[PDB]
């Protein structure tokens, strides 16, 4: 991720990759040229090879050890250039090699924004399948949808708004708790890590409402356990806030941060003691939670128990 090298052997390599002279690039590999050579502006041979469209050169540099997520000075990566110039064959290999699908640049433009502006239907559906979140906003708040219309690509607009719709349905299903509906939408290409304008994902909703069955399904498909809304709240927080024991276990088993804090500074244990949950408190301690965590107002979980008149919960904590 990002380089800034400098060498005469590198300059020969960049020019060789730009012009697309496959062979002379290979000789420079053996002759000692640096695969990750960067020039003044941070451009690497993979950048020039991706924009030039020479798939042969791109494949070789990946094999040798080129940085797939190399970000030049302007934030562009090989995926940006490979998308701004409509090289479908190159957008597919950089993704197999683990490239950041949603890589913001200096102006916040992700690779999808580019695939939408120019209307490369091919690259779009490719980026969408590899998890490219639809509601990607840049400096000007122009999502790929808000940008596809501004340039007259109406078939892209529909395919995007048709995806943003699916995501909203995924939250509504998780909120109300319909296991079959939430399975339909995932199977239709609904990003599990889709966060509405308030930063909430279907993982929070399945945890606060107590729809256990839907939780692990989101986690199984890769739901971010440590997802935070605009208030810094984690699905683990809401599992303790409401007091749904079974979901607390699953969230921790999958790697839920126990030290998480909302925008006030409440740990999942601060909330369990608050809401008077006798058993939820013993579970978070069982997993080693900071006993004397102080929120923004310096109150331990013990204090929240007394002020609310929580006898037994307070005792349990004083012992530990």
């Amino acid at each position: 991720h990002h380089h800034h090298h400098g060498s005469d052997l590198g300059k020969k390599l960049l020019e060789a990759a730009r012009a697309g002279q496959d062979d002379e690039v290979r000789i420079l590999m053996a002759n000692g040229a640096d695969v990750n050579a960067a020039d003044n502006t941070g451009t690497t041979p993979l950048h020039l090879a991706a924009y030039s469209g020479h798939l042969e050169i791109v494949e070789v540099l990946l094999k040798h050890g080129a940085d797939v997520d190399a970000s030049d000075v302007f934030g562009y990566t090989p995926l940006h250039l490979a998308a701004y110039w409509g090289h479908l064959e190159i957008v597919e290999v950089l993704l197999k090699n683990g490239a950041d699908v949603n890589a913001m640049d200096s102006d916040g433009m992700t690779p999808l924004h580019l695939a939408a502006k120019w209307g490369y239907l091919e690259i779009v559906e490719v980026l969408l399948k590899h998890g490219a979140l639809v509601k990607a906003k840049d400096k000007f708040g122009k999502t790929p949808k808000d940008l596809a219309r501004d340039n007259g690509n109406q078939f892209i607009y529909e395919l995007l708004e048709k995806a943003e719709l699916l995501e909203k349905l995924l939250l509504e299903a998780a909120r109300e708790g319909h296991r079959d509906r939430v399975e339909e939408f995932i199977k239709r290409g609904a990003d599990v890590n889709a966060a509405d304008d308030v930063g909430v994902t279907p993982l929070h909703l399945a945890a606060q409402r107590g729809h256990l069955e839907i939780v692990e399904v989101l986690l199984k498909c890769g739901a971010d356990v440590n997802a935070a809304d605009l208030w810094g709240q984690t699905p683990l927080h809401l599992a303790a806030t409401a007091g749904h024991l079974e979901i607390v276990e699953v969230l921790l088993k999958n790697g839920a941060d126990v030290n998480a804090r909302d925008n006030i500074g409440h740990t999942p244990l601060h909330l369990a003691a608050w809401a008077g949950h006798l058993e939820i408190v013993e579970v978070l301690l069982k997993h080693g939670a900071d006993v004397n965590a102080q929120d923004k107002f310096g109150k331990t979980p013990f204090d929240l128990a007394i002020d609310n008149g929580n006898e037994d919960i307070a005792e349990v904590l004083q012992k530990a």
């Binding site: 003044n40 020039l48 924009y51 302007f74 562009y76 250039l81 701004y84 110039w85």
Partner: peptide, 9 residues
């Protein structure tokens, strides 16, 4: 230059 239509050097 950012989009590689022209090169700064």
């Amino acid at each position: 230059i950012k989009n590689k239509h022209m090169n700064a050097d």
